Design a protein around this nucleic acid. Structure first.
Lengths: 50, 100, 149, 60
RNA sequence: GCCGAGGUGGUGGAAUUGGUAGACACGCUACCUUGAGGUGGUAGUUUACGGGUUCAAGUCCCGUCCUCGGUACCA
RNA sequence: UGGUUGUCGUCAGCUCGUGUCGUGAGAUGUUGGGUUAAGUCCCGCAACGAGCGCAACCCUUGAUCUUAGUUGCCAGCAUUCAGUUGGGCACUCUAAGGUGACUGCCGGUGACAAACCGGAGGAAGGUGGGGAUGACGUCAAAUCAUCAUGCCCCUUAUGACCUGGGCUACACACGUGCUACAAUGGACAGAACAAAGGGCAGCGAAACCGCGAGGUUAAGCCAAUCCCACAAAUCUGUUCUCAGUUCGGAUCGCAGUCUGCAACUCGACUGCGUGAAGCUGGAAUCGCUAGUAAUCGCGGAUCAGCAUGCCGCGGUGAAUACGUUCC
RNA sequence: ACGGUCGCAAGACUGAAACUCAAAGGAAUUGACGGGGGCCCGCACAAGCGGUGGAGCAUGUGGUUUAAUUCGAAGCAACGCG
């Protein structure tokens, strides 16, 4: 139910979750922390779209 | 959060990581193991070597949830803990919210 | 009826490009080229400062990342709502790139559209960015509906 | 009430502010032009009938 | 009079004490669409009553009123 | 009912003469091929023509030649606080007469036509941009309240005067509009640029006073002179830093100003204080193809006074038109 | 419908009247319409830019209150209209 209602939540959420299936209801943009700081992703953003 | 840098002695996590998020959006923060996920929110929300600039809205009411359970006023009753003003503030606000 | 064509003005006093004046005519609110030229030159001076390059090459690189190859138009037959993928002719590639730069720059939100357009160019350069959401999503819509052409 | 009201305008009232503009050819206020001292429709009619020495059809 | 049953919104009606002028399907109202109706789309209105128990009551409890039916005087 | 309009619609249609075909209603022309913005024009045709429509002539803008120089203009000529003076009609300007763009000329396509596509010239290129112009008719559309009106009705009243109120009501809906929700922003200071139009019991300089709305005396002007009239967005500095705020101004209290017998219902404006809803809007829906949309001020009618409406005026000034699949 | 014949049945065949209307109908013409076809055109659609619908007020109109809220307009083509 927290997976459900946080989708109907009215924005400004910073959802750290080590799950892969919880964030499928609570994600529009991602912050992938990686080597040498953040990576502000808005999609998968892998393999450097060409 | 502009030009942020976070280091622990020689353990360096953040370096010049410029991102800016406004209201009304779902921000998922993913770290495989130790990406500072828990560390960023502390250095979003606090001082202590957020090297750079972290600006946040002064009139926003940030409700915070921790990973670690070590922020309880221990040995208190949830009666005294939860702010229950008059009559249905125990029931219609609170005790229904607990049992339900 | 038939196709009609248009024109645009060649130079800019700093950065002598056609397409930079095309962006000057874009993002003009209420008939004010002066505000858009000031915003534009302060933004390109930030792009020249913060990254030690000439902002022409960063700006064209960002364009190359945003310019979509494939629009997907509509073709409704019956009750079907089919979408048909269209090879975009490169004029519309440039103009959709400029619209997406301008729209998602002012849609970002920072403490001037100087900074917003500059950071949007800096994101579309290092391809992950806000207009490139629209690039990726249009290519995914053309990739899924490629059966019609 | 038409000729009575025309007659009342043709009077001198108690006060100068009771004075209002009126037709002089086809009795009505609301759009009597001060220059011609004429009602609007009567101005259109007479200006069609070749009178009123200034006005022709306008284009510019 | 006695026994048994139900008393909610304009309607029929679910709800094991935990939030309902109403949650569910209709009506109803304001708008949209249409030439104007209908369909369709958007938003909107204290539990028969009175007194408790309870942190909380449609519900648990004590009383009153109404209606269905069985059980009687009489034709 | 006359008269005068909306609408389809600036759509390209609508008819008639004479002829022929059909018992007749009708048909024909007006259909077909190309072409157009066009029933435009050509070609073919049982039709040949014609009329109302379309276009053109009319007004404006785009440029140049001539005339005409003050109140307009200042290039060289010196004086000027100042185009003020003398000087000059060159230049802009003004307002008259012209010239000018006609597919005219080239090449290509296409019946050889009509026309179309590119090219050259040119300020202007294919009705150059716009206006005015609104066919037969449709809605028994609108107007008996601008007027005139046939018929019917009232008449010491359904007519007339006067004051007062109302046409500004207010729980609600609904058209059009204005202002915002903000950093391309708000406030403050500096610099510049307009067009069009108005002025006789009117426009009203300048000076003075008032924070301001304005006030008192008054020059010039029946106006290319003088006034309205200090354009504003813009540009450049200072300042705030993303909040229901240095956003926005509703609403409201008090004290004022002007107009006018008189501003209570029921005027505009100013000053102080208060500062709301609103952080870009659901279904749906509208305008616009270029100096347009967006935006910024200016002007004039009406009128003593009342403009967010309307009618014109300039300022900056875009994005897009692949196409006709859909409404 | 009644009667009759045929039929296992369903029904077939034969077949009126009271009553009711001043039309029903055919073919063809001119139009209009089609959730018929073709061709074309218009900010009509698409391609865009800005809005309206949300808020505040100005303004006009419906309802309602009224002593009167004067009269006229009412889909496009009434509703900052006379």
């Amino acid at each position: 139910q927290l997976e459900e209602t946080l989708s109907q939540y009215s924005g400004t959420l910073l959802a750290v979750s080590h799950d892969r299936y919880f964030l499928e209801k609570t994600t529009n943009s991602k912050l992938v922390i990686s080597n040498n700081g953040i990576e502000k992703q808005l999609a998968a953003a892998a393999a450097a779209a060409a | 959060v502009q030009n942020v840098t976070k280091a622990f002695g020689e353990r360096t996590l953040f370096k010049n990581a410029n991102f800016t998020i406004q209201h009304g959006e779902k921000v998922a923060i993913i770290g495989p193991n130790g990406s500072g996920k828990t560390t960023l929110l502390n250095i979003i929300l606090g001082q202590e070597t957020a090297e750079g600039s972290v600006w946040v809205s002064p009139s926003a009411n940030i409700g915070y949830l921790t990973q670690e359970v070590f922020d309880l006023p221990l040995e208190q009753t949830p009666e005294e803990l939860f702010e229950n003003e008059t009559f249905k503030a125990r029931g219609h606000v609170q005790n229904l919210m607990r049992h339900l | 009826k038939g196709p009609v064509a248009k024109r645009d003005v060649l130079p800019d006093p700093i950065y002598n490009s056609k397409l930079v004046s095309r962006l000057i005519n874009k993002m003009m609110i209420d008939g004010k080229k002066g505000k858009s030229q000031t915003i534009l030159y302060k933004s390109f001076d930030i792009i020249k400062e913060r990254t030690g390059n000439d902002a022409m090459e960063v700006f064209e690189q960002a364009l190359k990342n945003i310019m979509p190859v494939l629009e997907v138009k509509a073709r409704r037959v019956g009750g079907a709502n089919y979408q048909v993928p269209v090879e975009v002719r490169p004029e519309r590639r440039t103009t959709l790139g400029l619209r997406w730069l301008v729209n998602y720059a002012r849609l970002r939100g920072e403490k001037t559209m100087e900074e917003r357009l500059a950071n949007e160019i800096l994101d579309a350069a290092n391809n992950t960015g806000a207009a490139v959401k629209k690039r990726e999503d249009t290519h995914k819509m053309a990739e899924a509906n490629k059966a019609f052409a | 009430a038409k000729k009575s009201m025309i007659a009342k305008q043709q009077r001198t009232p108690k006060f100068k502010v009771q004075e209002y503009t009126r037709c002089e050819r086809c009795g009505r206020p609301h759009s009597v032009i001060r220059k011609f001292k004429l009602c609007r429709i009567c101005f259109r009619e007479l200006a069609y009938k070749g009178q009123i020495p200034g006005v022709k059809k306008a284009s510019w």
